[PDB]
Structure 1
Amino acid sequence: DRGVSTFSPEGRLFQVEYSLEAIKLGSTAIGIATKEGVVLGVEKRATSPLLESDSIEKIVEIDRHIGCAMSGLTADARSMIEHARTAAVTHNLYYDEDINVESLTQSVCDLALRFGEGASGEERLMSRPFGVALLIAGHDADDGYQLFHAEPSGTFYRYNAKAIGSGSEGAQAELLNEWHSSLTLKEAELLVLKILKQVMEEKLDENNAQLSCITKQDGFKIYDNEKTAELIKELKEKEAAE
């Protein structure tokens, strides 16, 4: 244990790789982009039955047109959300418009880079990389509905669908089979609920899993517990008939 920004002989950054391991230990979060909106769903994973589950905030609003789901060391995500919200509001202040989803993501990934000490060139005010990944969903006029995966490595990919957290290997293979360009928002809602149901230890209900979407018309919405419950019914009845 010598340095925090040391390369291995293979040419990988040690600490960056290990932070990616921390994300694998987190709750599952799934996002699906359609032409009618982008759905974001998460596993809540209460550590005890006395935990009040609705105090678990793994889906957060960034701006009316941008929301995000988190997985990993979730406390690390606060300052990332704060930066995202500031960047979006600041952009609207400077430019009388909504920030592009891609631009917002690039901003959050710039912030992710600022670990180390100073790095002979600029300045760094963080001792370690973030231990958390983000799924960033939104709409803008140029590129429509968008899903990005923001990693503590400072890279980000656009996805048609994406799973992060402890169940991500199984969920991603599932998403590979189920996703098609013609999906409705209702079909996406059901798929997220289905694939979470598969990978979760506990039995999925309206208290241990949470749903949200972002549509151009209504913006970013976190579905309340009554609405998801009714969508769970609909999934139970759909699968049981096949």
Structure 2
Amino acid sequence: EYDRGVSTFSPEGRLFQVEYSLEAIKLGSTAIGIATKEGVVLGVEKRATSPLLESDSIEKIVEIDRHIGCAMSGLTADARSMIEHARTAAVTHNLYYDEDINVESLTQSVCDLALRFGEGASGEERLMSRPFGVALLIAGHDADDGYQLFHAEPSGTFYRYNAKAIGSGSEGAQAELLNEWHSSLTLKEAELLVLKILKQVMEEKLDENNAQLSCITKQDGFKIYDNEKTAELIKELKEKEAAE
């Protein structure tokens, strides 16, 4: 109807396939993200499916560059195209200017790739028939506005967020963010906050072979925390549930 064409307007007045893209984020293993002014933490659910799975080499944490981290949640066939493009873009900026790329500018570039649906619209080359099916939590630190967290849609639109949760359990996560986000969080209090919201939308036992934490810090760069650190933080959350 309106799903046989990759560029057609519908009798609502906006794209139908794009709606289906938003409903492909609800097939992703939850990626949660808390930004504060002490650094930004990204956590992701890996999702174990069997004890035959090797999960400590699988992660939905990705390095775009030294000063920018990313977590992806949704169809990950689509996310491979976008992450490779993010990696080039950052390196191009550093080629052209010998300078760090802003988190906002980097995200905006990835939104330009996300708008490439159509096969006969405008002048610019179409390398797709449809839209993507994946959203991003590009976190980072630039020296202009400090720490930043952006949420990028497969639409080709982006918002700056202070906290965002995408994936299957996104609505149940987002309810917890409204009541639990505040400006006086710390880096470590933020890190425990990730696991709290992740535990509810976890379908298994929350442990360190199905969750991965990562930070982006000015002075340490982008560091992906090892499963030892994840295991520790998980246990201390249960001690703050032993306070209630």
- TM-score norm. by structure 2 comes to 0.96
In structure 1, stretches of 5+ residues that fail to align are: none
- 2:78 aligned partner: 76
Q: CA RMSD in A?
A: 1.1
User: After the TM superposition, which of the residue ranges 75-84 and 96-105 deviates more from structure 2?
Assistant: 75-84
Instruction: Give the Cα separation in 2 of the matches to 1:101 and 1:120.
Output: 28
Stretch moving more, 172-181 or 50-59: 50-59
Q: Tell me if the contact between 2:59 and 2:212 (Cα under 8 Å) persists in the aligned partners.
A: no
- State the secondary structure of the residue aligned to 1:145: strand
Identical-pair percentage: 100
User: What's the CA shift string for 1:66-118, capped at 9, x where partnerless?
Assistant: 00001111121112111111111110110011000000000000011112214
8 Å CA contact 2:70, 2:137 repeated in 1: yes
Contact 1:65/1:139 (8 A) holds in 2 = yes
In structure 1, how many angstroms separate the alpha carbons of the residues matched to 2:16 and 2:158? 19
1:142-192 deviation per Cα after TM superposition (whole angstroms, max 9, x unaligned): 111111111000001111100001111010010110011111000010000
Following TM superposition, by how much is the alpha carbon of 1:10 offset from its aligned partner in structure 2, in angstroms?
A: 1.3
Task: Report the CA distance between 1:121 and its aligned residue.
Answer: 2.6
Distance apart, 1:120 and its partner CA = 3.1
Match of 2:112 among 101, 110, 130: 110
- Say which SS state the counterpart of residue 55 (structure 1) adopts: coil
Distance 2:202 2:232 in 1: 19
Deviation (angstroms), 1:15: 0.9
Partners of 2:176 and 2:197 within 8 A in 1 = yes
Q: Secondary structure at 1:54's aligned position in 2?
A: coil
CA distance in structure 1 between the partners assigned to 2:120 and 2:88 by the alignment = 23
Q: Answer with 161-170 or 74-83: which moved more.
A: 74-83
Please list every run of 5 or more consecutive structure 2 residues that lacks an aligned counterpart in the other structure.
none
CA deviations on 1:104-141 (whole Å, 9 max, x unpaired) are 00000001111221413322111221111110000001
* Contact kept in structure 2, 1:66 and 1:220, CA below 8 Å: yes
- C-alpha distance in 2 between matches for 1:88 and 1:99: 6
Deviations 1:3-58 (A, max 9, x none): 12222211120111101101111110001111100000011112222111123220
Query: 1:218, 1:111 → 2: CA distance?
Result: 30
1:5/1:14 contact within 8 Å kept: no
Is this contact kept in 2: 1:4–1:14, CA < 8 A? no
For 2:41 and 2:177, locate their aligned partners in 1 and report how far apart those are by CA, in whole Å.
Answer: 13
